Write an enzyme that holds these catalytic residues in place. Structure first.
Site, mmCIF file in Angstrom:
data_model
loop_
_atom_site.group_PDB
_atom_site.id
_atom_site.type_symbol
_atom_site.label_atom_id
_atom_site.label_comp_id
_atom_site.label_asym_id
_atom_site.label_seq_id
_atom_site.Cartn_x
_atom_site.Cartn_y
_atom_site.Cartn_z
ATOM 1 N N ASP A 154 33.832 41.390 34.046
ATOM 2 C CA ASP A 154 35.150 40.780 34.691
ATOM 3 C C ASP A 154 35.259 39.380 34.211
ATOM 4 O OD1 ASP A 154 37.438 40.703 36.121
ATOM 5 O OD2 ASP A 154 36.585 40.532 37.957
ATOM 6 N N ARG A 158 40.278 33.071 36.210
ATOM 7 C CA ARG A 158 39.941 33.169 37.503
ATOM 8 C C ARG A 158 38.487 33.175 38.110
ATOM 9 N NH1 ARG A 158 41.813 38.130 36.122
ATOM 10 N NH2 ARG A 158 40.459 39.795 36.541
ATOM 11 N N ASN A 159 37.553 33.680 37.040
ATOM 12 C CA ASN A 159 36.226 33.522 37.533
ATOM 13 C C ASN A 159 35.515 32.417 36.792
ATOM 14 O OD1 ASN A 159 36.696 35.824 39.008
ATOM 15 N ND2 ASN A 159 36.053 37.344 37.404
ATOM 16 N N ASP A 172 30.701 35.268 39.390
ATOM 17 C CA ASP A 172 30.758 36.522 39.606
ATOM 18 C C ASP A 172 30.275 37.204 38.343
ATOM 19 O OD1 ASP A 172 32.121 35.763 41.766
ATOM 20 O OD2 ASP A 172 33.883 36.878 41.290
#
Length: 293
Positions: A154, A158-159, A172
């Site tokens: 992922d 945003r991570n 993450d």
């Protein structure tokens, strides 16, 4: 315990990672979801020499309304972060509080939030050297994660978290098996499958590899040089699958260096064996830093 008739079962003590709970002074919240939160804190005596010296950290914890499943997910994330080892461009584990209280997972602090929010806030600062450095640092982070046999599954803007000194920290990376992870930062969040970041084999066959992370890095590059733009703008999921199956990909962003889009195209190869390795992306982006300066 049969002796006491204790109300709860205990997590195992790892002396290497156990941090004293009294030495962790909890401050203001960095984030708060429905079942989890992240609190800013000062950790006294984080390194052996220099006791009583305060260092700022982020403390990841579950709220009282969380389930045993959610605890198992956080514990699983903790154990992956124990094995991964230190690197500048990933959020590293600093310590843990497992005994005589709720689980605290103490990690590195990134004050400026995620990379998407960082880039969207600086829209007419973000010159080409800064943007290529963001891409380079993420590439170096992913190079390290590949060398320690860690697949992200992922990777997105945003991570990637951003420190006070503009250092890109990948977050993450060691989440538990599954898709329904709790959000630690906001109360209403996107629970859906991140389809617009996923490689075709990850989308259709559910095959996640280092090669499928390279596809995702391509979309993160597109995010960076659109200044936190949303990928495939206004294209529904049904149209996206159809479009990807024809071999079509996103257009080159405006004012984007041709070489960077070249790297995106190679990241977006249908055949994963033709996609570049993270070592090659690091080496390619290093050359762009010298030219752009």
């Amino acid at each position: 315990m049969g002796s006491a008739g204790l109300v709860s079962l205990d997590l195992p003590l790892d002396p290497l990672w156990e941090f004293p709970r009294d030495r962790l002074v909890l401050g203001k919240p960095l984030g708060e979801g429905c079942f989890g939160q992240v609190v800013r804190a000062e950790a006294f005596g984080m390194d052996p020499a220099r006791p009583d010296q305060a260092s700022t950290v982020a403390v990841k914890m579950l709220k009282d309304n969380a389930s045993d499943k959610d605890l198992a997910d956080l514990v699983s994330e903790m154990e992956v972060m124990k094995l991964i080892g230190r690197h500048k461009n990933i959020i590293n584990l600093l310590g843990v509080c497992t005994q005589e209280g709720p689980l605290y997972v103490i990690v590195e602090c990134a004050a400026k939030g995620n990379l998407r929010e960082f880039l969207r806030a600086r829209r007419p600062p973000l010159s080409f050297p800064v943007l290529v450095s963001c891409a380079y640092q993420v590439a170096r982070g992913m190079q390290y994660l590949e060398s320690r046999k860690c697949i992200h599954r992922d990777l997105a803007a945003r991570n990637v978290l951003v420190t006070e000194d503009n250092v890109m920290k990948i977050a993450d990376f060691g989440l538990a098996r599954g898709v329904h992870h709790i959000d630690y930062y906001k109360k209403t969040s996107n629970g859906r499958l991140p389809v617009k970041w996923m490689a075709p084999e990850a989308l259709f066959d559910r095959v996640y590899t280092h090669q499928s992370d390279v596809w995702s890095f391509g979309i993160l590059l597109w995010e960076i040089f659109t200044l936190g733009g949303s990928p495939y703008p206004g294209i529904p999921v049904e149209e996206l699958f159809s479009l990807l199956r024809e071999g079509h990909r996103m257009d080159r962003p405006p004012h984007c260096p041709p070489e960077l889009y070249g790297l995106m195209r190679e990241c977006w190869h249908a055949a994963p064996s033709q996609r570049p390795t993270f070592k090659q992306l690091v080496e390619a982006l290093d050359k762009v830093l010298l030219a752009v300066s």
